[PDB]
Amino acid sequence: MENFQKVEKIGEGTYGVVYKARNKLTGEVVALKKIRTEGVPSTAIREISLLKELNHPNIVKLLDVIHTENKLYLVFEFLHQDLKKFMDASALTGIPLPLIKSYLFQLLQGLAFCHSHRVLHRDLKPQNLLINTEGAIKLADFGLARAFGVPVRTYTHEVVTLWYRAPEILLGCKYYSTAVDIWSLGCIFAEMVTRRALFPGDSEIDQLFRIFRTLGTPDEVVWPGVTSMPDYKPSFPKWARQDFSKVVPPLDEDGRSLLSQMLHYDPNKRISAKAALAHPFFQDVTKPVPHLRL
Ligand SMILES: COc1cc(NCc2cccnc2)c(C(N)=O)cc1[N+](=O)[O-]
């Protein structure tokens, strides 16, 4: 391109086409995301530009925001693999617990950092978690959602996964809190453990009902105010809560305990990233080297 050279198409993300590219001048290899539609609000430019300062070892660095030719390009540090591909590659044997624990610990540090800076992700999923050969894992796309209101779809009729969406979002709550990210990470934690998505909904109501069938239909006792949420319906079926030991076997009680706190219905009772880091589950955390085949 003007200063780059497409090495290939890394994919077709939630916002647009993503290319692995090499800077012709510096020689650095980066991920280039071309954002979708015919104006690009200046509000989004200032918002995104702010994220260039959000630097942490567990957050994918946003190197540049280029608004030229009236188009929007986001330049990110490049990592060779995402957690979704890695979990598929580890499907037969499963990701070893020490590595699951290291990944969860690093992700929580990343969230604690973003959340302490009043930045929410809002759309965490295995595909947005990038890993390298040194055992590091990083959150990609933090803050883009807010700087772009609602996602809906990618840019080429692609189906948005609802699997990691917190219940308050599904019940129509208009204001997101840091708690939505904890929920998504809890779903991801469970998926790494069992090797199966925790709530693989295929519609918004199927998503909600899958959650209800496992954690029990929420009520005013466990979630004060839930019955007044925008999309709550008194006609929701009432399902009994399932024993946690049946949800993520064979995770130990430290892990089940942390997961249950990351999955509390009430966003206000849900554990913060900071508090989660102090959970006994991380008492023996280490940083193993993964087996990446690139
Ligand atoms: C398409 O998604 C992405 C994937 C990425 N890497 C993981 C990867 C996956 C497949 C092949 N090669 C690398 C990166 C990045 N920052 O390195 C960015 C985006 N993105 O959305 O900006």
PDB file of C-alpha atoms and ligand atoms in Angstrom:
ATOM      1  CA  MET A   1       0.000   0.000   0.000  1.00  0.00           C
ATOM      2  CA  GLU A   2       1.037   3.618   0.551  1.00  0.00           C
ATOM      3  CA  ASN A   3       3.574   2.510   3.178  1.00  0.00           C
ATOM      4  CA  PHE A   4       2.627  -1.148   3.570  1.00  0.00           C
ATOM      5  CA  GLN A   5       2.439  -4.383   1.612  1.00  0.00           C
ATOM      6  CA  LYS A   6      -0.237  -6.980   2.271  1.00  0.00           C
ATOM      7  CA  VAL A   7       1.367 -10.267   3.273  1.00  0.00           C
ATOM      8  CA  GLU A   8      -2.093 -11.850   3.201  1.00  0.00           C
ATOM      9  CA  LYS A   9      -5.671 -11.688   4.461  1.00  0.00           C
ATOM     10  CA  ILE A  10      -5.711 -12.626   8.149  1.00  0.00           C
ATOM     11  CA  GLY A  11      -9.488 -12.666   7.998  1.00  0.00           C
ATOM     12  CA  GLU A  12     -12.720 -10.715   7.845  1.00  0.00           C
ATOM     13  CA  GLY A  13     -13.310  -9.465  11.378  1.00  0.00           C
ATOM     14  CA  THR A  14     -16.260  -7.901  13.167  1.00  0.00           C
ATOM     15  CA  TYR A  15     -15.425  -4.468  11.729  1.00  0.00           C
ATOM     16  CA  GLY A  16     -13.851  -5.327   8.390  1.00  0.00           C
ATOM     17  CA  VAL A  17     -11.054  -7.008   6.457  1.00  0.00           C
ATOM     18  CA  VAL A  18      -7.864  -7.708   8.423  1.00  0.00           C
ATOM     19  CA  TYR A  19      -4.497  -8.061   6.698  1.00  0.00           C
ATOM     20  CA  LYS A  20      -1.075  -9.194   7.884  1.00  0.00           C
ATOM     21  CA  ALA A  21       1.099  -6.445   6.491  1.00  0.00           C
ATOM     22  CA  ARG A  22       4.714  -5.356   6.472  1.00  0.00           C
ATOM     23  CA  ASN A  23       5.708  -1.722   6.837  1.00  0.00           C
ATOM     24  CA  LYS A  24       7.936  -1.099   3.803  1.00  0.00           C
ATOM     25  CA  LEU A  25       9.962   1.490   5.728  1.00  0.00           C
ATOM     26  CA  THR A  26      10.392   0.093   9.248  1.00  0.00           C
ATOM     27  CA  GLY A  27      10.125  -3.539   8.182  1.00  0.00           C
ATOM     28  CA  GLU A  28       7.766  -4.254  11.071  1.00  0.00           C
ATOM     29  CA  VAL A  29       5.025  -6.857  10.557  1.00  0.00           C
ATOM     30  CA  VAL A  30       1.589  -5.720  11.765  1.00  0.00           C
ATOM     31  CA  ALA A  31      -2.125  -6.459  11.552  1.00  0.00           C
ATOM     32  CA  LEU A  32      -4.009  -3.931   9.455  1.00  0.00           C
ATOM     33  CA  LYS A  33      -7.760  -3.612   9.932  1.00  0.00           C
ATOM     34  CA  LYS A  34      -9.715  -1.573   7.376  1.00  0.00           C
ATOM     35  CA  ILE A  35     -12.815  -0.221   9.100  1.00  0.00           C
ATOM     36  CA  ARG A  36     -16.218  -0.091   7.391  1.00  0.00           C
ATOM     37  CA  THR A  37     -19.292   3.286   6.114  1.00  0.00           C
ATOM     38  CA  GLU A  38     -19.340   6.604   4.250  1.00  0.00           C
ATOM     39  CA  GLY A  39     -18.390   9.225   6.826  1.00  0.00           C
ATOM     40  CA  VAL A  40     -16.565   7.893   9.894  1.00  0.00           C
ATOM     41  CA  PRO A  41     -17.702  10.218  12.751  1.00  0.00           C
ATOM     42  CA  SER A  42     -14.924  12.369  14.211  1.00  0.00           C
ATOM     43  CA  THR A  43     -16.191  11.235  17.613  1.00  0.00           C
ATOM     44  CA  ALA A  44     -14.921   7.754  16.752  1.00  0.00           C
ATOM     45  CA  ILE A  45     -11.531   9.125  15.675  1.00  0.00           C
ATOM     46  CA  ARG A  46     -10.841  10.856  19.000  1.00  0.00           C
ATOM     47  CA  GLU A  47     -12.171   7.846  20.920  1.00  0.00           C
ATOM     48  CA  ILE A  48      -9.945   5.379  19.079  1.00  0.00           C
ATOM     49  CA  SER A  49      -6.928   7.702  19.150  1.00  0.00           C
ATOM     50  CA  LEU A  50      -7.228   7.645  22.953  1.00  0.00           C
ATOM     51  CA  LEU A  51      -6.668   3.888  22.925  1.00  0.00           C
ATOM     52  CA  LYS A  52      -3.194   4.345  21.428  1.00  0.00           C
ATOM     53  CA  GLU A  53      -2.150   5.260  24.977  1.00  0.00           C
ATOM     54  CA  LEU A  54      -3.687   2.170  26.573  1.00  0.00           C
ATOM     55  CA  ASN A  55      -0.471   0.124  26.715  1.00  0.00           C
ATOM     56  CA  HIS A  56      -0.100  -3.066  28.789  1.00  0.00           C
ATOM     57  CA  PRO A  57       1.684  -6.386  28.135  1.00  0.00           C
ATOM     58  CA  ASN A  58      -1.639  -8.234  27.982  1.00  0.00           C
ATOM     59  CA  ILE A  59      -3.342  -5.834  25.599  1.00  0.00           C
ATOM     60  CA  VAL A  60      -2.646  -5.941  21.856  1.00  0.00           C
ATOM     61  CA  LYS A  61      -0.949  -2.620  21.114  1.00  0.00           C
ATOM     62  CA  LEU A  62      -2.780  -0.265  18.767  1.00  0.00           C
ATOM     63  CA  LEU A  63       0.154   1.221  16.841  1.00  0.00           C
ATOM     64  CA  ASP A  64      -1.751   3.653  14.658  1.00  0.00           C
ATOM     65  CA  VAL A  65      -5.119   4.978  13.625  1.00  0.00           C
ATOM     66  CA  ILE A  66      -5.040   6.212  10.043  1.00  0.00           C
ATOM     67  CA  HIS A  67      -7.863   8.280   8.633  1.00  0.00           C
ATOM     68  CA  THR A  68      -6.829   9.069   5.053  1.00  0.00           C
ATOM     69  CA  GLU A  69      -8.642   8.848   1.721  1.00  0.00           C
ATOM     70  CA  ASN A  70     -11.693   9.208   3.987  1.00  0.00           C
ATOM     71  CA  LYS A  71     -11.249   5.601   5.194  1.00  0.00           C
ATOM     72  CA  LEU A  72     -10.320   4.150   8.609  1.00  0.00           C
ATOM     73  CA  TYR A  73      -7.318   1.875   9.108  1.00  0.00           C
ATOM     74  CA  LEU A  74      -6.261   0.463  12.464  1.00  0.00           C
ATOM     75  CA  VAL A  75      -2.702  -0.818  12.762  1.00  0.00           C
ATOM     76  CA  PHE A  76      -2.097  -3.372  15.531  1.00  0.00           C
ATOM     77  CA  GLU A  77       0.879  -5.291  16.854  1.00  0.00           C
ATOM     78  CA  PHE A  78       0.834  -8.725  15.255  1.00  0.00           C
ATOM     79  CA  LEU A  79       0.533 -12.079  17.023  1.00  0.00           C
ATOM     80  CA  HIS A  80       0.527 -15.370  15.122  1.00  0.00           C
ATOM     81  CA  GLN A  81      -2.453 -17.180  16.632  1.00  0.00           C
ATOM     82  CA  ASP A  82      -5.748 -16.671  18.440  1.00  0.00           C
ATOM     83  CA  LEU A  83      -7.142 -18.727  21.316  1.00  0.00           C
ATOM     84  CA  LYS A  84      -9.987 -20.112  19.193  1.00  0.00           C
ATOM     85  CA  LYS A  85      -7.565 -21.834  16.822  1.00  0.00           C
ATOM     86  CA  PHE A  86      -5.378 -22.948  19.733  1.00  0.00           C
ATOM     87  CA  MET A  87      -8.351 -24.554  21.551  1.00  0.00           C
ATOM     88  CA  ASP A  88      -9.307 -26.397  18.372  1.00  0.00           C
ATOM     89  CA  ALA A  89      -5.730 -27.618  17.966  1.00  0.00           C
ATOM     90  CA  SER A  90      -5.731 -28.758  21.618  1.00  0.00           C
ATOM     91  CA  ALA A  91      -9.167 -30.429  21.373  1.00  0.00           C
ATOM     92  CA  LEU A  92      -7.910 -34.031  21.642  1.00  0.00           C
ATOM     93  CA  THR A  93      -5.776 -33.521  24.722  1.00  0.00           C
ATOM     94  CA  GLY A  94      -7.129 -30.288  26.152  1.00  0.00           C
ATOM     95  CA  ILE A  95      -5.077 -27.275  27.253  1.00  0.00           C
ATOM     96  CA  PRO A  96      -3.092 -28.238  30.368  1.00  0.00           C
ATOM     97  CA  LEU A  97      -4.488 -26.678  33.592  1.00  0.00           C
ATOM     98  CA  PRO A  98      -1.302 -24.738  34.407  1.00  0.00           C
ATOM     99  CA  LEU A  99      -1.590 -23.068  30.985  1.00  0.00           C
ATOM    100  CA  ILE A 100      -5.341 -22.419  31.333  1.00  0.00           C
ATOM    101  CA  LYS A 101      -4.529 -20.831  34.693  1.00  0.00           C
ATOM    102  CA  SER A 102      -1.664 -18.729  33.295  1.00  0.00           C
ATOM    103  CA  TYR A 103      -3.868 -17.525  30.424  1.00  0.00           C
ATOM    104  CA  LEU A 104      -6.786 -16.647  32.718  1.00  0.00           C
ATOM    105  CA  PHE A 105      -4.429 -14.830  35.143  1.00  0.00           C
ATOM    106  CA  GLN A 106      -2.894 -12.728  32.336  1.00  0.00           C
ATOM    107  CA  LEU A 107      -6.317 -11.924  30.839  1.00  0.00           C
ATOM    108  CA  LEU A 108      -7.582 -10.736  34.241  1.00  0.00           C
ATOM    109  CA  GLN A 109      -4.489  -8.506  34.591  1.00  0.00           C
ATOM    110  CA  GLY A 110      -5.325  -7.094  31.164  1.00  0.00           C
ATOM    111  CA  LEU A 111      -8.937  -6.478  32.167  1.00  0.00           C
ATOM    112  CA  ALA A 112      -7.920  -4.977  35.542  1.00  0.00           C
ATOM    113  CA  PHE A 113      -5.723  -2.525  33.635  1.00  0.00           C
ATOM    114  CA  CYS A 114      -8.382  -1.567  31.081  1.00  0.00           C
ATOM    115  CA  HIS A 115     -11.114  -1.353  33.683  1.00  0.00           C
ATOM    116  CA  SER A 116      -8.971   0.850  35.967  1.00  0.00           C
ATOM    117  CA  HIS A 117      -8.733   3.194  32.949  1.00  0.00           C
ATOM    118  CA  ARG A 118     -12.488   3.123  32.382  1.00  0.00           C
ATOM    119  CA  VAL A 119     -12.145   1.142  29.157  1.00  0.00           C
ATOM    120  CA  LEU A 120     -14.428  -1.847  28.521  1.00  0.00           C
ATOM    121  CA  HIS A 121     -14.048  -4.499  25.860  1.00  0.00           C
ATOM    122  CA  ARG A 122     -17.755  -5.506  25.546  1.00  0.00           C
ATOM    123  CA  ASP A 123     -17.141  -8.294  23.007  1.00  0.00           C
ATOM    124  CA  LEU A 124     -14.572 -10.741  24.370  1.00  0.00           C
ATOM    125  CA  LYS A 125     -14.320 -14.136  22.665  1.00  0.00           C
ATOM    126  CA  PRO A 126     -11.628 -16.728  21.954  1.00  0.00           C
ATOM    127  CA  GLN A 127     -11.029 -15.195  18.531  1.00  0.00           C
ATOM    128  CA  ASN A 128     -10.136 -11.855  20.192  1.00  0.00           C
ATOM    129  CA  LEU A 129      -7.504 -13.413  22.464  1.00  0.00           C
ATOM    130  CA  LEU A 130      -4.095 -13.620  20.817  1.00  0.00           C
ATOM    131  CA  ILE A 131      -1.161 -15.750  21.904  1.00  0.00           C
ATOM    132  CA  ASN A 132       2.548 -15.963  21.078  1.00  0.00           C
ATOM    133  CA  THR A 133       5.313 -18.524  21.549  1.00  0.00           C
ATOM    134  CA  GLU A 134       6.410 -17.117  24.893  1.00  0.00           C
ATOM    135  CA  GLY A 135       3.295 -18.058  26.833  1.00  0.00           C
ATOM    136  CA  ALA A 136       1.726 -14.607  26.630  1.00  0.00           C
ATOM    137  CA  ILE A 137      -1.919 -13.997  25.781  1.00  0.00           C
ATOM    138  CA  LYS A 138      -3.350 -10.607  24.868  1.00  0.00           C
ATOM    139  CA  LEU A 139      -6.787  -8.999  24.616  1.00  0.00           C
ATOM    140  CA  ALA A 140      -7.441  -7.596  21.124  1.00  0.00           C
ATOM    141  CA  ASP A 141     -10.055  -4.931  20.239  1.00  0.00           C
ATOM    142  CA  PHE A 142     -10.475  -3.255  23.633  1.00  0.00           C
ATOM    143  CA  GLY A 143     -12.581  -0.094  23.408  1.00  0.00           C
ATOM    144  CA  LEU A 144     -13.566  -0.422  19.745  1.00  0.00           C
ATOM    145  CA  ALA A 145     -17.167  -1.328  20.626  1.00  0.00           C
ATOM    146  CA  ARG A 146     -17.801   1.875  22.605  1.00  0.00           C
ATOM    147  CA  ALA A 147     -16.101   3.949  19.903  1.00  0.00           C
ATOM    148  CA  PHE A 148     -18.568   2.248  17.537  1.00  0.00           C
ATOM    149  CA  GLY A 149     -21.759   1.883  19.590  1.00  0.00           C
ATOM    150  CA  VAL A 150     -23.330  -1.453  18.618  1.00  0.00           C
ATOM    151  CA  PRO A 151     -21.675  -4.268  16.574  1.00  0.00           C
ATOM    152  CA  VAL A 152     -24.626  -6.167  15.062  1.00  0.00           C
ATOM    153  CA  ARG A 153     -22.669  -7.735  12.188  1.00  0.00           C
ATOM    154  CA  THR A 154     -19.166  -7.770  10.687  1.00  0.00           C
ATOM    155  CA  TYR A 155     -19.239  -6.035   7.286  1.00  0.00           C
ATOM    156  CA  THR A 156     -20.113  -8.969   5.040  1.00  0.00           C
ATOM    157  CA  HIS A 157     -23.169 -10.794   6.389  1.00  0.00           C
ATOM    158  CA  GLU A 158     -21.317 -12.770   9.070  1.00  0.00           C
ATOM    159  CA  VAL A 159     -23.122 -14.192  12.116  1.00  0.00           C
ATOM    160  CA  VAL A 160     -22.142 -12.486  15.390  1.00  0.00           C
ATOM    161  CA  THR A 161     -21.587 -15.062  18.136  1.00  0.00           C
ATOM    162  CA  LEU A 162     -23.686 -14.427  21.239  1.00  0.00           C
ATOM    163  CA  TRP A 163     -22.006 -17.210  23.215  1.00  0.00           C
ATOM    164  CA  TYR A 164     -20.049 -14.847  25.472  1.00  0.00           C
ATOM    165  CA  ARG A 165     -22.642 -12.120  26.018  1.00  0.00           C
ATOM    166  CA  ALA A 166     -23.559 -11.300  29.646  1.00  0.00           C
ATOM    167  CA  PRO A 167     -27.230 -11.667  30.640  1.00  0.00           C
ATOM    168  CA  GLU A 168     -27.782  -7.960  31.354  1.00  0.00           C
ATOM    169  CA  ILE A 169     -26.923  -7.237  27.717  1.00  0.00           C
ATOM    170  CA  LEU A 170     -29.344  -9.927  26.544  1.00  0.00           C
ATOM    171  CA  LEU A 171     -32.116  -8.496  28.752  1.00  0.00           C
ATOM    172  CA  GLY A 172     -31.775  -5.116  27.049  1.00  0.00           C
ATOM    173  CA  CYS A 173     -29.740  -3.183  29.611  1.00  0.00           C
ATOM    174  CA  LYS A 174     -28.520  -0.032  27.868  1.00  0.00           C
ATOM    175  CA  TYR A 175     -25.581   0.718  30.153  1.00  0.00           C
ATOM    176  CA  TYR A 176     -22.647  -1.692  30.116  1.00  0.00           C
ATOM    177  CA  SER A 177     -20.382  -2.130  33.114  1.00  0.00           C
ATOM    178  CA  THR A 178     -16.968  -3.714  33.555  1.00  0.00           C
ATOM    179  CA  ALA A 179     -18.922  -6.780  34.683  1.00  0.00           C
ATOM    180  CA  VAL A 180     -19.820  -7.750  31.111  1.00  0.00           C
ATOM    181  CA  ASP A 181     -16.133  -8.516  30.436  1.00  0.00           C
ATOM    182  CA  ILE A 182     -15.789 -10.667  33.540  1.00  0.00           C
ATOM    183  CA  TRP A 183     -18.827 -12.695  32.374  1.00  0.00           C
ATOM    184  CA  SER A 184     -17.353 -13.280  28.903  1.00  0.00           C
ATOM    185  CA  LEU A 185     -14.013 -14.314  30.382  1.00  0.00           C
ATOM    186  CA  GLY A 186     -15.802 -16.700  32.715  1.00  0.00           C
ATOM    187  CA  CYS A 187     -17.460 -18.337  29.664  1.00  0.00           C
ATOM    188  CA  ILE A 188     -14.054 -18.582  27.988  1.00  0.00           C
ATOM    189  CA  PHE A 189     -12.469 -20.065  31.145  1.00  0.00           C
ATOM    190  CA  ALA A 190     -15.174 -22.773  31.197  1.00  0.00           C
ATOM    191  CA  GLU A 191     -14.670 -23.455  27.483  1.00  0.00           C
ATOM    192  CA  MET A 192     -10.891 -23.965  27.884  1.00  0.00           C
ATOM    193  CA  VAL A 193     -11.607 -26.371  30.754  1.00  0.00           C
ATOM    194  CA  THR A 194     -14.363 -28.506  29.184  1.00  0.00           C
ATOM    195  CA  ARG A 195     -13.318 -28.034  25.527  1.00  0.00           C
ATOM    196  CA  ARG A 196     -16.888 -27.107  24.691  1.00  0.00           C
ATOM    197  CA  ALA A 197     -18.585 -23.699  24.563  1.00  0.00           C
ATOM    198  CA  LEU A 198     -20.487 -23.093  27.800  1.00  0.00           C
ATOM    199  CA  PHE A 199     -23.558 -21.366  26.276  1.00  0.00           C
ATOM    200  CA  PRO A 200     -23.560 -21.859  22.500  1.00  0.00           C
ATOM    201  CA  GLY A 201     -26.750 -19.956  21.705  1.00  0.00           C
ATOM    202  CA  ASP A 202     -27.852 -19.601  18.110  1.00  0.00           C
ATOM    203  CA  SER A 203     -30.315 -16.720  18.687  1.00  0.00           C
ATOM    204  CA  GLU A 204     -30.623 -14.082  21.405  1.00  0.00           C
ATOM    205  CA  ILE A 205     -33.411 -15.945  23.188  1.00  0.00           C
ATOM    206  CA  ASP A 206     -31.704 -19.320  22.760  1.00  0.00           C
ATOM    207  CA  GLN A 207     -28.597 -17.711  24.330  1.00  0.00           C
ATOM    208  CA  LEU A 208     -30.591 -16.395  27.264  1.00  0.00           C
ATOM    209  CA  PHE A 209     -32.442 -19.672  27.766  1.00  0.00           C
ATOM    210  CA  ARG A 210     -29.234 -21.742  27.612  1.00  0.00           C
ATOM    211  CA  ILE A 211     -27.905 -19.522  30.412  1.00  0.00           C
ATOM    212  CA  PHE A 212     -31.167 -19.899  32.353  1.00  0.00           C
ATOM    213  CA  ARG A 213     -31.167 -23.674  31.935  1.00  0.00           C
ATOM    214  CA  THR A 214     -27.757 -23.878  33.573  1.00  0.00           C
ATOM    215  CA  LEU A 215     -27.592 -21.144  36.196  1.00  0.00           C
ATOM    216  CA  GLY A 216     -31.327 -21.130  36.841  1.00  0.00           C
ATOM    217  CA  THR A 217     -33.878 -18.554  35.705  1.00  0.00           C
ATOM    218  CA  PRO A 218     -32.912 -15.384  37.596  1.00  0.00           C
ATOM    219  CA  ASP A 219     -35.330 -13.786  40.058  1.00  0.00           C
ATOM    220  CA  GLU A 220     -35.443 -10.772  42.363  1.00  0.00           C
ATOM    221  CA  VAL A 221     -33.666 -12.708  45.119  1.00  0.00           C
ATOM    222  CA  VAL A 222     -30.454 -13.482  43.218  1.00  0.00           C
ATOM    223  CA  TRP A 223     -30.691 -10.459  40.906  1.00  0.00           C
ATOM    224  CA  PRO A 224     -32.496  -7.412  42.369  1.00  0.00           C
ATOM    225  CA  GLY A 225     -34.113  -5.459  39.546  1.00  0.00           C
ATOM    226  CA  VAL A 226     -33.977  -8.205  36.928  1.00  0.00           C
ATOM    227  CA  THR A 227     -37.781  -8.294  36.476  1.00  0.00           C
ATOM    228  CA  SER A 228     -37.792  -4.628  35.406  1.00  0.00           C
ATOM    229  CA  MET A 229     -35.110  -4.977  32.753  1.00  0.00           C
ATOM    230  CA  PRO A 230     -36.169  -3.876  29.223  1.00  0.00           C
ATOM    231  CA  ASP A 231     -36.550  -7.323  27.670  1.00  0.00           C
ATOM    232  CA  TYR A 232     -37.447  -9.359  30.733  1.00  0.00           C
ATOM    233  CA  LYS A 233     -40.733 -11.234  30.344  1.00  0.00           C
ATOM    234  CA  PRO A 234     -42.727 -12.715  33.230  1.00  0.00           C
ATOM    235  CA  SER A 235     -43.432 -15.510  30.772  1.00  0.00           C
ATOM    236  CA  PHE A 236     -39.799 -16.741  30.844  1.00  0.00           C
ATOM    237  CA  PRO A 237     -39.827 -20.422  31.832  1.00  0.00           C
ATOM    238  CA  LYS A 238     -38.518 -21.012  35.342  1.00  0.00           C
ATOM    239  CA  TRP A 239     -35.575 -23.413  35.300  1.00  0.00           C
ATOM    240  CA  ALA A 240     -33.831 -24.690  38.425  1.00  0.00           C
ATOM    241  CA  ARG A 241     -30.124 -24.002  38.857  1.00  0.00           C
ATOM    242  CA  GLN A 242     -27.811 -26.861  37.965  1.00  0.00           C
ATOM    243  CA  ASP A 243     -25.037 -28.038  40.273  1.00  0.00           C
ATOM    244  CA  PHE A 244     -21.782 -26.333  39.307  1.00  0.00           C
ATOM    245  CA  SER A 245     -19.894 -29.640  39.599  1.00  0.00           C
ATOM    246  CA  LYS A 246     -21.826 -30.816  36.545  1.00  0.00           C
ATOM    247  CA  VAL A 247     -21.079 -27.654  34.510  1.00  0.00           C
ATOM    248  CA  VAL A 248     -17.266 -27.635  34.321  1.00  0.00           C
ATOM    249  CA  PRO A 249     -16.062 -31.076  35.373  1.00  0.00           C
ATOM    250  CA  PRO A 250     -13.393 -31.915  36.271  1.00  0.00           C
ATOM    251  CA  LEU A 251     -12.326 -28.447  37.490  1.00  0.00           C
ATOM    252  CA  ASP A 252     -11.366 -28.349  41.189  1.00  0.00           C
ATOM    253  CA  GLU A 253     -13.261 -26.343  43.826  1.00  0.00           C
ATOM    254  CA  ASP A 254     -10.858 -23.379  43.624  1.00  0.00           C
ATOM    255  CA  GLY A 255     -11.620 -23.093  39.909  1.00  0.00           C
ATOM    256  CA  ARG A 256     -15.374 -23.752  40.282  1.00  0.00           C
ATOM    257  CA  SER A 257     -15.492 -21.169  43.056  1.00  0.00           C
ATOM    258  CA  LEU A 258     -13.812 -18.488  40.889  1.00  0.00           C
ATOM    259  CA  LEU A 259     -15.962 -19.347  37.891  1.00  0.00           C
ATOM    260  CA  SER A 260     -19.168 -19.073  39.951  1.00  0.00           C
ATOM    261  CA  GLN A 261     -18.166 -15.563  41.034  1.00  0.00           C
ATOM    262  CA  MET A 262     -17.410 -14.564  37.445  1.00  0.00           C
ATOM    263  CA  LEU A 263     -20.871 -15.845  36.448  1.00  0.00           C
ATOM    264  CA  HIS A 264     -23.067 -14.289  39.150  1.00  0.00           C
ATOM    265  CA  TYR A 265     -26.227 -12.916  37.528  1.00  0.00           C
ATOM    266  CA  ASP A 266     -26.204  -9.559  39.308  1.00  0.00           C
ATOM    267  CA  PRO A 267     -23.503  -7.451  37.549  1.00  0.00           C
ATOM    268  CA  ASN A 268     -22.878  -5.852  40.953  1.00  0.00           C
ATOM    269  CA  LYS A 269     -22.148  -9.108  42.744  1.00  0.00           C
ATOM    270  CA  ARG A 270     -19.988 -10.387  39.869  1.00  0.00           C
ATOM    271  CA  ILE A 271     -16.286 -10.393  40.859  1.00  0.00           C
ATOM    272  CA  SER A 272     -13.988  -7.656  39.563  1.00  0.00           C
ATOM    273  CA  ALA A 273     -10.856  -8.491  37.592  1.00  0.00           C
ATOM    274  CA  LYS A 274      -8.765  -7.085  40.471  1.00  0.00           C
ATOM    275  CA  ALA A 275     -10.443  -9.245  43.118  1.00  0.00           C
ATOM    276  CA  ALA A 276     -10.378 -12.303  40.834  1.00  0.00           C
ATOM    277  CA  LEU A 277      -6.572 -12.005  40.677  1.00  0.00           C
ATOM    278  CA  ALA A 278      -6.405 -12.539  44.458  1.00  0.00           C
ATOM    279  CA  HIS A 279      -8.602 -15.695  44.329  1.00  0.00           C
ATOM    280  CA  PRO A 280      -6.993 -18.862  45.846  1.00  0.00           C
ATOM    281  CA  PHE A 281      -7.222 -20.461  42.414  1.00  0.00           C
ATOM    282  CA  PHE A 282      -4.114 -18.458  41.427  1.00  0.00           C
ATOM    283  CA  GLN A 283      -2.019 -19.404  44.461  1.00  0.00           C
ATOM    284  CA  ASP A 284       0.156 -21.720  42.342  1.00  0.00           C
ATOM    285  CA  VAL A 285      -0.017 -19.860  39.028  1.00  0.00           C
ATOM    286  CA  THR A 286       2.999 -20.080  36.703  1.00  0.00           C
ATOM    287  CA  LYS A 287       3.749 -19.165  33.089  1.00  0.00           C
ATOM    288  CA  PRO A 288       4.111 -22.334  30.954  1.00  0.00           C
ATOM    289  CA  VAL A 289       5.282 -22.362  27.336  1.00  0.00           C
ATOM    290  CA  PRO A 290       2.585 -23.484  24.898  1.00  0.00           C
ATOM    291  CA  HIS A 291       3.098 -25.864  21.973  1.00  0.00           C
ATOM    292  CA  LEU A 292       2.380 -23.550  19.026  1.00  0.00           C
ATOM    293  CA  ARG A 293       2.529 -24.921  15.517  1.00  0.00           C
ATOM    294  CA  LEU A 294       2.779 -21.892  13.211  1.00  0.00           C
TER     295      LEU A 294
HETATM  296  C1  LIG B   1      -8.422 -11.403  11.847  1.00  0.00           C
HETATM  297  O1  LIG B   1      -8.239 -11.047  13.197  1.00  0.00           O
HETATM  298  C2  LIG B   1      -7.018 -10.668  13.687  1.00  0.00           C
HETATM  299  C3  LIG B   1      -6.020 -11.658  13.944  1.00  0.00           C
HETATM  300  C4  LIG B   1      -4.722 -11.302  14.462  1.00  0.00           C
HETATM  301  N1  LIG B   1      -3.803 -12.209  14.696  1.00  0.00           N
HETATM  302  C5  LIG B   1      -4.068 -13.669  14.824  1.00  0.00           C
HETATM  303  C6  LIG B   1      -3.892 -14.372  13.493  1.00  0.00           C
HETATM  304  C7  LIG B   1      -4.923 -15.189  12.960  1.00  0.00           C
HETATM  305  C8  LIG B   1      -4.757 -15.841  11.711  1.00  0.00           C
HETATM  306  C9  LIG B   1      -3.544 -15.648  11.032  1.00  0.00           C
HETATM  307  N2  LIG B   1      -2.523 -14.863  11.519  1.00  0.00           N
HETATM  308  C10 LIG B   1      -2.711 -14.240  12.735  1.00  0.00           C
HETATM  309  C11 LIG B   1      -4.447  -9.913  14.721  1.00  0.00           C
HETATM  310  C12 LIG B   1      -3.241  -9.493  15.215  1.00  0.00           C
HETATM  311  N3  LIG B   1      -3.179  -8.339  15.947  1.00  0.00           N
HETATM  312  O2  LIG B   1      -2.229 -10.128  15.023  1.00  0.00           O
HETATM  313  C13 LIG B   1      -5.451  -8.929  14.464  1.00  0.00           C
HETATM  314  C14 LIG B   1      -6.734  -9.283  13.951  1.00  0.00           C
HETATM  315  N4  LIG B   1      -7.610  -8.359  13.737  1.00  0.00           N
HETATM  316  O3  LIG B   1      -8.887  -8.644  13.695  1.00  0.00           O
HETATM  317  O4  LIG B   1      -7.243  -7.097  13.575  1.00  0.00           O
END
